[PDB]
Design a protein around this ligand. Structure first.
Ligand code: HEM
Ligand SMILES: Nc1ccc2nccc(-n3cncn3)c2c1
Ligand SMILES: Nc1ccc2nccc(-n3cncn3)c2c1
Length: 394
């Protein structure tokens, strides 16, 4: 006898397991066991992933219901699982969405300046350099302080909550509550702090005193700050780190983007498509009995949408493991999700990566790994796949 197939399959974010394609061919929806011991349906074709993400009877917020089968333990209060629903119900969606585009005057200049400063520091100090801790993640952290309107010097302490906040644990995590409560208190103080007048938090600070929002809770305003900083920083920092590995691995693409930087947006879209940064399928709970391929999913069951199952599906993306800058469907990947919960940070996340890559290629056109690729240490039991350090030379 063998056990029920366990997820996740591998924490390594530099290569997809050959097992994913086998799985998608033989059983593109199949039962698995999660780290909590719960059963779930793992969906791994493009067709069935899209079906689940576009059908709201597969619910995000019902994953937080007490007693549901769980992918992992909550690290936020259960009402925060419906965060963007709560933002929309408060009449804040338009405003929040507006504040996190890359469009604000000065923002792109700020990202280039910041990327260049981090890279000049690395060049002064001499190789090897850690492009996760000393480039991608500080770039993400600086970006999100600017987008929120909060002091750059408050970035590092907020960032150090994230290695716990974004854990994928079988059990509740006592430090996640300590850091959540502390970070909520910080964002409630930001809303009361008259120096904060710009960015997302400057905007929510004004809307909080406007009569159209007088009954929106102070708790929701603070929660938007904590959640958007943390999710945006983890998602952009982790994507840019694993995208740099994929680029550094492909010297010809490196050289092509360095020579023709106008191709960087197409190259970032393919780096998004192939990205392995999400460590787990996206979870949903069925609220009805729903047919998915050859399975009737029953009400109350957990479904996990494997993004790399969709994004490496050769029926949708032929020669799926190759980066090709001339595909006829380049933005049709699921790296930002699909449907009701499609990422509102997508444009910002694209621009963070495009600017970080353009700056890296101009400053370190010879960038290469400084260790054999197998020596990267992949973080485990985390909601993202990320190497703990990314040592490079140039
Ligand atoms: C390259 C970077 C990013 C990637 C790959 C990414 C990916 C995703 C994915 C896959 C989803 C859908 C989750 C689901 O349907 O279960 C999502 C949702 C979300 N993302 Fe992003 N994200 C990125 C950057 C951002 C940024 C910069 C922010 C904000 C500053 C952000 C905020 C959100 C929020 C608030 C949601 C929830 C939307 C909802 O429930 O409707 N993300 N992201
Ligand atoms: N436990 C925490 C603490 C801070 C957070 N900040 C942003 C986003 C979080 N998570 C949302 N889901 C999982 N973490 C956070 C989770
Ligand atoms: N950037 C992301 C990616 C996946 C997410 N999954 C669930 C909830 C999210 N957030 C809702 N608000 C902030 N993040 C998510 C945010």
């Amino acid at each position: 006898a063998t056990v029920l197939l366990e997820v996740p399959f591998s924490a390594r974010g530099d290569r997809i397991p050959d097992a994913v394609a086998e799985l998608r061919t033989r059983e593109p929806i199949r039962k698995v066991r999660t780290i909590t011991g719960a059963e779930a349906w793992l969906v791994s074709s493009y067709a069935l992933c899209t079906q689940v993400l576009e059908d709201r009877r597969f619910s995000m917020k019902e994953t937080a219901a007490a007693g549901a089968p769980r992918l992992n333990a909550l690290t936020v209060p259960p009402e925060v699982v419906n965060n963007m629903g709560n933002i929309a119900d408060a009449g804040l969606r338009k405003a929040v969405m507006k504040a996190i585009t890359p469009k604000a005057p000065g923002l792109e200049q700020f990202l280039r300046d910041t990327a260049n400063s981090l890279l000049d520091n690395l060049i002064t100090e001499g190789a090897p350099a850690d492009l996760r801790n000393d480039f991608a993640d500080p770039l993400a952290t600086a970006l999100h302080c600017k987008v929120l309107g909060i002091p750059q010097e408050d970035g590092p302490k907020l960032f150090r909550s994230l290695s716990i906040a974004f854990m994928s644990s079988a059990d509740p995590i006592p430090a996640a509550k300590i850091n959540w409560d502390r970070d909520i208190e910080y964002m409630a103080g930001i809303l009361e702090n008259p120096n904060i007048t710009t960015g997302l938090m400057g905007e929510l600070s004004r809307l909080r005193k406007d009569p159209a929002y007088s009954h929106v809770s102070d708790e929701l305003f603070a929660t938007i700050g904590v959640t958007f900083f943390g999710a945006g920083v983890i998602s952009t920092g982790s994507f840019l780190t694993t995208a740099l590995i994929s680029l550094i691995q492909r010297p010809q693409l490196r050289n092509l983007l360095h020579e023709k930087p106008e191709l960087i947006p197409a190259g970032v879209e393919e780096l998004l498509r192939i990205n392995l940064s999400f460590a787990d399928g996206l979870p949903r709970l069925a609220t009805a009995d729903i047919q998915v391929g050859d399975v009737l999913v029953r009400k109350g069951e957990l479904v996990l949408v494997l993004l790399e199952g969709a994004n490496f599906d050769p029926e949708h993306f032929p020669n799926p493991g190759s980066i090709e800058l001339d595909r006829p469907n380049p933005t049709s990947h699921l790296a930002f999700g699909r449907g009701q919960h499609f990422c509102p940070g997508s444009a910002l996340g694209r621009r963070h990566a495009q600017i970080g890559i353009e700056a890296l290629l101009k400053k370190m056109p010879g960038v290469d790994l400084a260790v054999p690729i197998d020596q990267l240490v992949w973080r485990t039991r985390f909601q993202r796949r990320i190497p703990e350090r990314l040592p490079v030379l140039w």
